[PDB]
Amino acid sequence: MAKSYPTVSAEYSEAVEKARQKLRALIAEKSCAPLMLRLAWHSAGTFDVSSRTGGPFGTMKNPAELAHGANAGLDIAVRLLEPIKEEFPILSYADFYQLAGVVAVEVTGGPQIPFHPGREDKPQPPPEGRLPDATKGSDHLRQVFGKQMGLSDQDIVALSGGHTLGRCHKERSGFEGAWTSNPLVFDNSYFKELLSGDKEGLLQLPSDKALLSDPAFRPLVDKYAADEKAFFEDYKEAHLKLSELGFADA
Numbered sequence: 001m002a003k004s005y006p007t008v009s010a011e012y013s014e015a016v017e018k019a020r021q022k023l024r025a026l027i028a029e030k031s032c033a034p035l036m037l038r039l040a041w042h043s044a045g046t047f048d049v050s051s052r053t054g055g056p057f058g059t060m061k062n063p064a065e066l067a068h069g070a071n072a073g074l075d076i077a078v079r080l081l082e083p084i085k086e087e088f089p090i091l092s093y094a095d096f097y098q099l100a101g102v103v104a105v106e107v108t109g110g111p112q113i114p115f116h117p118g119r120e121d122k123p124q125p126p127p128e129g130r131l132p133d134a135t136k137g138s139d140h141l142r143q144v145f146g147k148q149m150g151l152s153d154q155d156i157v158a159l160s161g162g163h164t165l166g167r168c169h170k171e172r173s174g175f176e177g178a179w180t181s182n183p184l185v186f187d188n189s190y191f192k193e194l195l196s197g198d199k200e201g202l203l204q205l206p207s208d209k210a211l212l213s214d215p216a217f218r219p220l221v222d223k224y225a226a227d228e229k230a231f232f233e234d235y236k237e238a239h240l241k242l243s244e245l246g247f248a249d250a
């Protein structure tokens, strides 16, 4: 009841469904689900509830936001998706990039995240610096996810599980390596790798390790490592909330 979703035309809804089908095909065919999940996350995760600036409002199309250090490489994602976007002029970029994130999770075997259309493309990007710093710990995670975005500790741990997809690149973030042995498979393996400690061929960031040492995050890591169904349920709820920050609030 925290949300009141806007009415969109039948043509808008038809475009969402046709774009979803094109995205499912392209993301599977080009093996780019991890980059697309990262695109959706960096689009949404800049929301600050205190000023209601940032969030999933299409601003990753803006070159000034693509130039933020944290967004290195997302210009590739924007360009890869533009041929599909050109076929759907009615859709906002805001909706389109969140739809791409939902599809990325689907095509890699993850849960079905509900999608509600109607986000506006806002003219101003957020200021640089809202997204979490990979070198910091649990206090910082709570400031970014909790105080800025308004998300819970459960949401922090579940969303960190998105690192089951993809890898770090030395030219993008400067970190290098995959968290899991199956970077195109959406499962609970990130939490299992965290619990087993570091191992050759896989990466863990300090921000990932902060989940193990924090007394509230650690029981969630344990739960998700043991119970993929519980992980998928909590991930679905958290991703839905993330994708709608600042959007359709009652």
Ligand code: HEM
Binding pocket: 033, 034, 035, 037, 038, 041, 073, 132, 133, 134, 135, 159, 160, 161, 162, 163, 165, 166, 167, 168, 169, 170, 172, 173, 174, 175, 205, 207
């Ligand atoms: C919890 C705090 C987080 C931190 C510190 C963090 C940090 C990072 C860093 C440093 C990279 C590497 C970028 C590159 O070099 O290509 C990355 C990639 C990635 N992030 Fe996270 N991230 C966080 C949360 C999230 C969330 C909430 C999601 C989605 C639910 C997410 C999804 C991804 C994915 C899928 C990739 C791989 C991209 C690819 O392979 O191209 N991350 N993240």
Ligand SMILES: O=C1O[C@H]([C@@H](O)CO)C(O)=C1O
Binding pocket: 030, 031, 032, 033, 034, 035, 036, 076, 166
């Ligand atoms: O997830 C990703 O997809 C592309 C490429 O690997 C496949 O298109 C890319 O550069 C990513 O980081």
Ligand SMILES: O=C1O[C@H]([C@@H](O)CO)C(O)=C1O
Binding pocket: 069, 070, 129, 131, 132, 133, 134, 172, 173
């Ligand atoms: O501020 C930043 O955000 C990303 C990542 O830590 C959050 O996803 C990163 O590489 C930074 O420079």
Ligand SMILES: O=C1O[C@H]([C@@H](O)CO)C(O)=C1O
Binding pocket: 075, 076
């Ligand atoms: O296609 C392009 O790639 C470079 C840059 O994004 C590479 O990182 C850029 O300026 C182009 O327009």
Ligand SMILES: O=C1O[C@H]([C@@H](O)CO)C(O)=C1O
Binding pocket: 135, 136, 137, 138, 205, 206, 207, 209, 210, 211, 213, 214
């Ligand atoms: O190794 C670790 O990294 C985080 C934090 O120190 C990062 O700043 C932490 O809780 C771990 O035990």
Ligand code: NA
Binding pocket: 163, 164, 165, 166, 180, 181, 182, 183, 184, 185, 186, 187, 189
């Ligand atoms: Na994986």
